[PDB]
Symmetry: C2
């Protein structure tokens, strides 16, 4: 039960073609501009190719949690996770760190920056 074609009231149509496993591989808009996706073994998207050749890449964690994201250029943002599975820290391109401290139930308590403000 997957949609192959969608039609707007004006008549313009959106086209989708899938992988044999059901994962979306490409989408096409009314203007003809295409978008491409690559899916990993576990069904998690790892590369996006938009029009004009722009490419984004990603790395995923074994528990289904994003680790590294890259933009059109080589400018990564990275993530770090705690034992309970929450977002402990976030690292930007320049290397600045932002830290978070949660509760046992996951309820946020404090947020903190590199400059020291909290």
């Amino acid at each position: 039960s997957l949609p192959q074609t969608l039609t707007d009231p004006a008549g313009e149509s959106w086209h989708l073609r899938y992988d044999p496993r059901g994962n979306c591989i490409a989408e096409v808009d009314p203007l003809g501009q295409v978008t491409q996706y690559r899916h990993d073994a576990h069904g998690q998207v790892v590369e996006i190719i938009d029009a004009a050749g722009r490419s984004r890449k990603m790395r995923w964690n074994s528990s289904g949690q994003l680790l590294e994201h890259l933009d059109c250029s080589g400018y990564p943002t990275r993530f770090e996770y705690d034992r309970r599975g929450n977002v402990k820290a976030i690292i930007d391109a320049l290397g600045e760190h932002t830290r978070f401290h949660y509760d046992c139930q996951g309820r946020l308590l404090s947020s903190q920056l590199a400059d020291g403000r909290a």
Copy 2:
């Protein structure tokens, strides 16, 4: 109104001799063991010489706040103060940092270690 000599009920006596400014310079116990102090311009103790030649040195802040303390050997512990005048951080000999975050009224909110626990 400064005490020069003190006597216990048993008869043993403690002797003190002062600086012309009133600052304690030396103390003598019943056993004869002496203790020496050096006072800075503003009346803050900077060096303690106990018996057997053991020496401790200190540096003070312009607002009356301790900065560096040294033991008999060259093993310093340092302090760092915030704008409101509270103890922001403490540094041990090995270099481990402990951080504190206060309120506007000075009431403590969080304490944090180098390993990340809070």
